[PDB]
Design an enzyme around this catalytic site. Structure first.
Site, PDB file in Angstrom:
ATOM      1  N   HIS A 161       0.823  -1.188   0.000  1.00 51.25           N
ATOM      2  CA  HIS A 161       0.000   0.000   0.000  1.00 51.25           C
ATOM      3  C   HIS A 161       0.877   1.265   0.000  1.00 51.25           C
ATOM      4  O   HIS A 161       1.964   1.206   0.592  1.00 51.25           O
ATOM      5  CB  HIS A 161      -0.849   0.136   1.268  1.00 51.25           C
ATOM      6  CG  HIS A 161      -1.745  -1.024   1.543  1.00 51.25           C
ATOM      7  ND1 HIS A 161      -1.320  -2.153   2.198  1.00 51.25           N
ATOM      8  CD2 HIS A 161      -3.065  -1.199   1.279  1.00 51.25           C
ATOM      9  CE1 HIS A 161      -2.345  -2.993   2.307  1.00 51.25           C
ATOM     10  NE2 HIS A 161      -3.417  -2.449   1.752  1.00 51.25           N
ATOM     11  N   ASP A 214       2.291   1.961   3.340  1.00 49.61           N
ATOM     12  CA  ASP A 214       3.267   1.070   3.925  1.00 49.61           C
ATOM     13  C   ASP A 214       4.706   1.525   3.592  1.00 49.61           C
ATOM     14  O   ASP A 214       5.639   1.251   4.335  1.00 49.61           O
ATOM     15  CB  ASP A 214       3.196  -0.349   3.350  1.00 49.61           C
ATOM     16  CG  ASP A 214       1.855  -1.011   3.595  1.00 49.61           C
ATOM     17  OD1 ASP A 214       1.244  -0.777   4.651  1.00 49.61           O
ATOM     18  OD2 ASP A 214       1.418  -1.762   2.701  1.00 49.61           O
ATOM     19  N   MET A 216       2.375  -5.846  -7.974  1.00 47.78           N
ATOM     20  CA  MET A 216       1.050  -5.289  -7.653  1.00 47.78           C
ATOM     21  C   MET A 216       1.248  -4.196  -6.646  1.00 47.78           C
ATOM     22  O   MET A 216       2.173  -4.284  -5.810  1.00 47.78           O
ATOM     23  CB  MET A 216       0.184  -6.398  -7.028  1.00 47.78           C
ATOM     24  CG  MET A 216      -1.239  -5.975  -6.656  1.00 47.78           C
ATOM     25  SD  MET A 216      -1.291  -5.379  -4.936  1.00 47.78           S
ATOM     26  CE  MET A 216      -1.484  -6.943  -4.053  1.00 47.78           C
ATOM     27  N   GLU A 272     -10.968  -6.425  -4.774  1.00 45.51           N
ATOM     28  CA  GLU A 272     -10.823  -7.470  -3.780  1.00 45.51           C
ATOM     29  C   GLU A 272     -12.067  -7.452  -2.901  1.00 45.51           C
ATOM     30  O   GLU A 272     -12.207  -6.475  -2.150  1.00 45.51           O
ATOM     31  CB  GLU A 272      -9.601  -7.180  -2.887  1.00 45.51           C
ATOM     32  CG  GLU A 272      -9.463  -8.270  -1.813  1.00 45.51           C
ATOM     33  CD  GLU A 272      -8.115  -8.178  -1.108  1.00 45.51           C
ATOM     34  OE1 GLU A 272      -7.223  -7.387  -1.474  1.00 45.51           O
ATOM     35  OE2 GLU A 272      -7.968  -8.944  -0.136  1.00 45.51           O
ATOM     36  N   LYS A 319     -14.751  -8.496   0.155  1.00 44.64           N
ATOM     37  CA  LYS A 319     -14.741  -9.006   1.543  1.00 44.64           C
ATOM     38  C   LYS A 319     -16.147  -8.802   2.069  1.00 44.64           C
ATOM     39  O   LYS A 319     -16.735  -7.739   1.777  1.00 44.64           O
ATOM     40  CB  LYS A 319     -13.749  -8.210   2.391  1.00 44.64           C
ATOM     41  CG  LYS A 319     -13.529  -8.885   3.764  1.00 44.64           C
ATOM     42  CD  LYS A 319     -12.540  -8.078   4.631  1.00 44.64           C
ATOM     43  CE  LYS A 319     -12.304  -8.818   5.960  1.00 44.64           C
ATOM     44  NZ  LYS A 319     -11.514  -7.948   6.893  1.00 44.64           N
ATOM     45  N   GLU A 343      -9.646 -13.365  -2.027  1.00 41.61           N
ATOM     46  CA  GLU A 343      -8.783 -13.822  -0.940  1.00 41.61           C
ATOM     47  C   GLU A 343      -9.412 -15.057  -0.312  1.00 41.61           C
ATOM     48  O   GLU A 343     -10.637 -14.991  -0.072  1.00 41.61           O
ATOM     49  CB  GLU A 343      -8.680 -12.693   0.133  1.00 41.61           C
ATOM     50  CG  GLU A 343      -7.827 -13.179   1.305  1.00 41.61           C
ATOM     51  CD  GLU A 343      -7.602 -12.114   2.356  1.00 41.61           C
ATOM     52  OE1 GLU A 343      -7.069 -11.104   1.952  1.00 41.61           O
ATOM     53  OE2 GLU A 343      -7.898 -12.240   3.555  1.00 41.61           O
ATOM     54  N   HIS A 386     -11.609 -14.455   2.778  1.00 40.82           N
ATOM     55  CA  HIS A 386     -12.773 -13.567   2.689  1.00 40.82           C
ATOM     56  C   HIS A 386     -14.002 -14.294   2.183  1.00 40.82           C
ATOM     57  O   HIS A 386     -15.133 -14.130   2.692  1.00 40.82           O
ATOM     58  CB  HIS A 386     -12.465 -12.383   1.758  1.00 40.82           C
ATOM     59  CG  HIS A 386     -11.411 -11.489   2.369  1.00 40.82           C
ATOM     60  ND1 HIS A 386     -10.900 -10.383   1.726  1.00 40.82           N
ATOM     61  CD2 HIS A 386     -10.752 -11.570   3.553  1.00 40.82           C
ATOM     62  CE1 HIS A 386      -9.982  -9.835   2.517  1.00 40.82           C
ATOM     63  NE2 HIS A 386      -9.870 -10.519   3.638  1.00 40.82           N
ATOM     64  N   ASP A 389      -5.176 -13.648  -3.532  1.00 40.86           N
ATOM     65  CA  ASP A 389      -4.557 -13.516  -2.217  1.00 40.86           C
ATOM     66  C   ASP A 389      -4.701 -14.842  -1.478  1.00 40.86           C
ATOM     67  O   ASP A 389      -5.846 -15.271  -1.261  1.00 40.86           O
ATOM     68  CB  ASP A 389      -5.260 -12.466  -1.375  1.00 40.86           C
ATOM     69  CG  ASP A 389      -4.743 -11.063  -1.602  1.00 40.86           C
ATOM     70  OD1 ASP A 389      -3.897 -10.832  -2.491  1.00 40.86           O
ATOM     71  OD2 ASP A 389      -5.157 -10.110  -0.931  1.00 40.86           O
ATOM     72  N   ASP A 441     -11.692 -12.029  10.308  1.00 34.68           N
ATOM     73  CA  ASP A 441     -10.697 -12.348   9.258  1.00 34.68           C
ATOM     74  C   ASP A 441      -9.390 -12.755   9.907  1.00 34.68           C
ATOM     75  O   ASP A 441      -8.694 -11.875  10.423  1.00 34.68           O
ATOM     76  CB  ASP A 441     -10.560 -11.088   8.387  1.00 34.68           C
ATOM     77  CG  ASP A 441      -9.689 -11.235   7.151  1.00 34.68           C
ATOM     78  OD1 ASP A 441      -9.688 -12.287   6.484  1.00 34.68           O
ATOM     79  OD2 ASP A 441      -8.997 -10.261   6.789  1.00 34.68           O
ATOM     80  N   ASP A 476      -6.562 -14.335   8.502  1.00 37.38           N
ATOM     81  CA  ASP A 476      -5.376 -14.183   7.677  1.00 37.38           C
ATOM     82  C   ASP A 476      -4.261 -15.115   8.136  1.00 37.38           C
ATOM     83  O   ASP A 476      -3.090 -14.724   8.303  1.00 37.38           O
ATOM     84  CB  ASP A 476      -4.906 -12.714   7.705  1.00 37.38           C
ATOM     85  CG  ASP A 476      -5.812 -11.863   6.830  1.00 37.38           C
ATOM     86  OD1 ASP A 476      -6.862 -12.260   6.253  1.00 37.38           O
ATOM     87  OD2 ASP A 476      -5.492 -10.654   6.729  1.00 37.38           O
ATOM     88  N   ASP A 508      -1.445 -12.868   1.487  1.00 37.50           N
ATOM     89  CA  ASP A 508      -1.938 -11.753   2.290  1.00 37.50           C
ATOM     90  C   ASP A 508      -2.247 -12.407   3.640  1.00 37.50           C
ATOM     91  O   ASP A 508      -3.324 -12.934   3.838  1.00 37.50           O
ATOM     92  CB  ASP A 508      -3.160 -11.126   1.666  1.00 37.50           C
ATOM     93  CG  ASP A 508      -3.579  -9.912   2.469  1.00 37.50           C
ATOM     94  OD1 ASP A 508      -2.895  -9.584   3.466  1.00 37.50           O
ATOM     95  OD2 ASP A 508      -4.586  -9.289   2.133  1.00 37.50           O
TER      96      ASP A 508
HETATM   97  O1  LIG Z   1      -7.130  -8.065   2.363  1.00 41.92           O
HETATM   98  C1  LIG Z   1      -6.979  -6.659   2.572  1.00 41.92           C
HETATM   99  C2  LIG Z   1      -5.536  -6.182   2.450  1.00 41.92           C
HETATM  100  O2  LIG Z   1      -4.679  -6.877   3.373  1.00 41.92           O
HETATM  101  O3  LIG Z   1      -5.397  -4.739   2.680  1.00 41.92           O
HETATM  102  C3  LIG Z   1      -5.834  -4.171   1.421  1.00 41.92           C
HETATM  103  C4  LIG Z   1      -5.154  -4.985   0.349  1.00 41.92           C
HETATM  104  O4  LIG Z   1      -5.965  -5.096  -0.843  1.00 41.92           O
HETATM  105  C5  LIG Z   1      -5.040  -6.336   1.019  1.00 41.92           C
HETATM  106  O5  LIG Z   1      -5.590  -7.412   0.258  1.00 41.92           O
HETATM  107 NI    NI Z   2      -6.190  -9.398   0.818  1.00 42.00          NI
HETATM  108 NI    NI Z   3      -8.298 -11.221   5.152  1.00 44.72          NI
END
Ligand SMILES: OC[C@]1(O)OC[C@H](O)[C@@H]1O
Ligand code: NI
Ligand code: NI
Ligand SMILES: OC[C@]1(O)OC[C@H](O)[C@@H]1O
Ligand SMILES: OC[C@]1(O)OC[C@H](O)[C@@H]1O
Ligand SMILES: OC[C@]1(O)OC[C@H](O)[C@@H]1O
Ligand code: NI
Ligand code: NI
Ligand code: NI
Ligand code: NI
Ligand code: NI
Ligand code: NI
Lengths: 388, 388, 388, 388
Positions: B54, B57, B88, B181, B183, B217, B220, B245, B255, B257, B287
């Site tokens: 991002h 980040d 990406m 993406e 969710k 993802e 999600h 993802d 979520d 992850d 992710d």
């Molecule tokens: O899942 C959400 C995330 O971690 O934050 C946004 C970006 O798209 C990424 O996939």
């Molecule tokens: Ni993601």
């Molecule tokens: Ni997630």
């Protein structure tokens, strides 16, 4: 004041709803079968506008062409006697054992050809009875295990089936449209096109997408934990809400098909608000099962309650939107600004607008409360009739 | 035999994954922040192909244009030093308080204009770093209450935003595509475009749909109880799987992850089978969040396990499909027949084919078992390495 | 008529509720911190009866003994100034990184000993402030993976911790009881004692079970898809409902902590019906988070709505039970017979009663409808204020 | 190496499992009925240890006392012919319409008395056939709506029923114990005692709690999103795991009853690890349904796969625990310290221990990683047979 339905309110019921005998995966029927003619008469007395049917609800499976004509004529005389209409019909491609791995996406090619012929036969009958919408619920299209179904090949087969049905109605000159009814699971472990979004996406890949829309059911999207009014809004935005199945569901579990208003009551409020404010003009169809605890007096009570709860929620949602304090709250939460274009000035002016980035005060914007909790408590007070 | 990844396996990681400090809604960070340069170097050593980011980040929010150029140059030198790629990138439109009611569908129009400018700024940076896909996750687009968001107006605003971004990249001549993406919830009560199906349907209403696909993802779609390999198959069928993802999730809850392979292991097996048999050639992006119980040695262990589990499952899925006993079982379950057209002979010949209805033996067809349980136990034995 | 709360209605709020700054796993705080004194004053003005606290809400972590006495004295003066009470307190064993693998069931023994000392310190403070109930929510007791936690050893450690706390309060002579607050998940992947039933079962294995009950939260049992009024009934049947946390939740997903009345409104109706008909006399505590979209005016609006919705539902549930048509419906559905013993005549007379088996007409009994749908529509009409 | 079951592995199957004809709420039976004698013979050939039954599976409802003796004698001769045992039996209090509102907690008192007599009749038969455990699954005890069932009165009736059954077996001198099987929903909207925790808590209020334990089913706790190995650990900790039903379930939806190993495979791994490490010595009973897609060859394949998957997972869990690298990892994650008492030194020494609070270095403790991800990847490698 008085929540009495009339045929003008367009409430409709499937034959299979009030006629559900109460058989569930763990128990025997608790009610005897109802003659379709009897259901038409009782529903008319309650204020319904019409009824819907699967082919096998009206004409028992395997009937001879002569038994068939007899069942239809008796039905048609009940409709004539009562003023009831038949706005939708559908096919049963899920009860007979031959459909155990699906109808349109069965792995066996001969079953897929049979499923299409059984469907086409009933489309002709539906048009004869005046139906405007033909629903398809692919209850057995899916799988319990990963290797049993290549889903790309199955979507090819599903597309092929709906394309052929569209070719059929256009070649016959019929004025009928198709509505796909999504469900995420049950009776298969996972069902293909499991939500309104997957069905809408699929339709865009058909050869004549204008003939196809969705028939969402309250409880089915809630079986995936989704917000039903949001999915209906997306279907309305796309121009594809051709029909709707109303009932109630208490969260993520087996498909309960409770009467409308039961289950998630606030979601029912927001659904009626949306349907009435968007001017949805199709049938308000109840696809519900009176619980198997009930005798026939409880079946009719449950059917009447479907209609009653719609009309109470319609009154409360209209009172909400008409309340000047609510209209002020909507402006305070900037719903008016949501409806304005973000950038009618165009891309280039957005890029040159320093107030949109270089000189935007992000801290000032961030501090502005949205006032959504006061708005939501006004909606709660209206729903509960607690405004004073 | 040896499950060692190489950059050829195209494994990628977001900066925000290994760099997650462990803050959750009930607790403080358990790890210090990682310098992006340090993450690039450590991930390269583990065999990764590249990293994603991002905007916030890489460049801390509010940075001056000069601080910005400095952060980017250091990053670019780490990429040059290691051979790592940046396939990406994406925008953070969810952390800052100004985005509390959304970025593209915020009720306040000035916030929506800011969200677009923040996005466009980072698209330029992504192209400079060589990214081919730009992801959009509308984490704050949605609502906790019914009256706060008119979803038709919000979809209009969402469409307007993506249309403007497509206008921007086409006017600049950039070779980048967009991936939405989905969710279903978290952090908003309900998020708009909650599943792969809703996102695919939405894309078909954009002005230049060919520029947009999905970035699903694993966890999600599982937060809605859906079958992820099935949704990926639908995305592949539509030609829209632009990125993916990978992670793990234990059912319907917050979520998680988790690292890829954790969560629903059989769904991971069937996902890898599908990706590899369909010839998906994009990045295999993780992710994920290393759990906040871990120190930095556990972070790298968890990242390595993502890659390891993909490569084990790839080997087992390839062994499954190559096994002659499995190929025979697939024919026994008529997967070959699913791939054949139902009615290449056409509508008229189907209607005149008496073997498809009048003389179809439905009882004989119904008695044929599908043999799916033996097929599924062969797949289980292959997954567990129990073939002998 | 007027739904104005007074301190007599026993409504209480945690400091951490109205004081939640809006930090969630994806975003920064949207509100500044509230001074506890300010919250006490504002809540008193709204009609609340009292407040509750975690140790770390009142005294910031690491405070010196002198800073501590200062924070407490200021708090106590606000309580004296307003008439507010402090009926419950609890310990924060979840925010600090040292508690990342739990407090009482952390794998590290030194952390478990620290968690007990931090707890005992605050029990003394709670008694000083007059609390009658001490809540324990083991938010970090649990695991993301199977091998990380031997659950039998962890239950041994949990039992050891509560036994030591009971030894402590009995040796000090304190008049305080303990209430365990279950939650199924979040922030750990699975939390130990995940539902009211698991907590009730656990309590029966403690050395002095009479000192321990449950503090169920509406949304936590709904995160497992369970019926909260049913679980509360079981807790009341066991004599263990020592306290209750009221809020709202929209199904199975992350813990939303919405204001009470939001979420599942009919479940809120049936909960209030049960609490008021069972004569529950403890605090009606709201453990909720005003959404991070809100500014401080929305925080107070949301807190007021908690109380308002309780009082509306109390009025509607009382009107339901007092309605003679409802009382007749309850007899028609044989709720009176449910309350009669099945076999007060005893085992031997049951075995010799031929009317109970040999001469029981099962077909006649089976045909009797239960009339539950008419009863449930009367309850819906009462909830919606639609009786006429 | 060879995963061949023998009667020594104690695998058992209900008659109703392989004999399920495939009727589901949307479709007709796909298989003919199996004669119980035929099932006993086929299961013996596959390596099963024994079978279980509901009264109505063995003796069709309404049978005359003479037809009854005939059905039993034929069954007993098959058991003698094959060496098969009957370790458990149960009552069908859910299929007949008379049980539509429950058996033990039906609102009608005459139905509750009939349910007890039908139960007592089959307890005598079970003892005659040598069963050691009598299971009770209250599938119809519950409600679809709030007013239909006062849950405190229903728990009184449930307690009364189990107390009378305990009085009966103790007065007859029988060596049989009772096991309650929880399920959260389906076929009722909510079922009473919905999880293992609620059942364990309830048992502690019975007059002779030592006669009662639980019979948890994998898929039922997963229908509430709960961790089944954790609930089994709590049942083992309480000394109440009297029997267990093994099968598979893909998350929160209708009860799938898939073969064991299907569904959540990692949870199956951790369950077998726990059962074998705790030395559970009861039957490993499969309560599963071969999918209705299958013919009888697929039914036997599915039954064999239940046993096969248990034995593969048993081998992998034993290899995991025996691996010296895993034992070192368990110490690195301080599982050894979890098993040590927190405070064997006692309350007073804990209070005087300055190293537990005043001089505890919380920052040093917090920085220690738990190393759980490396441990979990070792468990994944063992499960997948990927250790080298
Ligand atoms: O899942 C959400 C995330 O971690 O934050 C946004 C970006 O798209 C990424 O996939
Ligand atoms: Ni993601
Ligand atoms: Ni997630
Ligand atoms: O919901 C499924 C259903 O009851 O059966 C099929 C028809 O479409 C109807 O909606
Ligand atoms: O629900 C959890 C909570 O908000 O934090 C812990 C305390 O018990 C309170 O109930
Ligand atoms: O799971 C329910 C079941 O199949 O039917 C009742 C018996 O207890 C068995 O476990
Ligand atoms: Ni339904
Ligand atoms: Ni429907
Ligand atoms: Ni909560
Ligand atoms: Ni709480
Ligand atoms: Ni089951
Ligand atoms: Ni069972």
């Amino acid at each position: 004041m008085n929540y009495q339905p009339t045929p003008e309110d367009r409430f409709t019921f499937g034959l299979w709803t009030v006629g559900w005998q109460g058989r569930d995966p763990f128990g025997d029927a608790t009610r005897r079968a109802l003659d379709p003619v009897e259901s038409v008469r009782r529903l008319a007395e309650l204020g319904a506008h019409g009824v819907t049917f699967h082919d096998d609800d009206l004409i028992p499976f395997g009937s001879s062409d002569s038994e068939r004509e007899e069942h239809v004529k008796r039905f048609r005389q009940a409709l004539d006697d009562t003023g009831m209409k038949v706005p939708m019909a559908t096919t049963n491609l899920f009860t007979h054992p031959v459909f155990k791995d699906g109808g349109f996406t069965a792995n066996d090619r001969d079953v897929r050809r049979y499923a299409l012929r059984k469907t086409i036969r009933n489309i002709d009958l539906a048009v004869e009875l005046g139906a405007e919408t033909y629903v398809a619920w692919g209850g057995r299209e899916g799988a319990e295990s990963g290797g049993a179904k290549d889903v790309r090949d199955a979507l090819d087969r599903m597309k092929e089936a709906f394309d052929l049905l569209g070719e059929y109605v256009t070649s016959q000159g019929y004025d009928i449209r198709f509505a796909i009814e999504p469900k995420p699971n049950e009776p298969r472990g996972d069902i293909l096109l499991p939500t309104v979004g997957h069905a809408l996406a699929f339709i865009e890949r058909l050869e004549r997408p204008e003939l196809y829309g969705v028939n969402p059911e309250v409880g089915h999207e809630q079986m995936a934990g989704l917000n039903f009014p949001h999915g209906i809004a997306q279907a309305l935005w796309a121009g594809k809400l051709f029909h709707i199945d109303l009932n109630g569901q208490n969260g993520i579990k087996y498909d309960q098909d409770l009467r409308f208003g039961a289950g998630d009551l606030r979601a029912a409020f927001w659904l009626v608000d949306l349907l009435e404010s968007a001017g949805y003009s199709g049938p308000r169809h109840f696809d519900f099962k009176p619980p198997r605890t009930e005798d026939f007096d409880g079946v009719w009570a449950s059917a009447a309650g479907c209609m009653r709860n719609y009309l109470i929620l319609k009154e409360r949602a209209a009172a909400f939107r008409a309340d000047p304090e609510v209209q002020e709250a909507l402006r305070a939460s900037r719903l008016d600004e949501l409806a304005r274009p973000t950038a009618a000035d165009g891309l280039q002016a957005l890029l040159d607008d320093r107030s949109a980035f270089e000189e935007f005060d992000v801290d000032a914007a961030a501090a502005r409360g949205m006032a959504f909790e006061r708005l939501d408590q006004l909606a709660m007070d209206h729903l509960l009739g607690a405004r004073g």
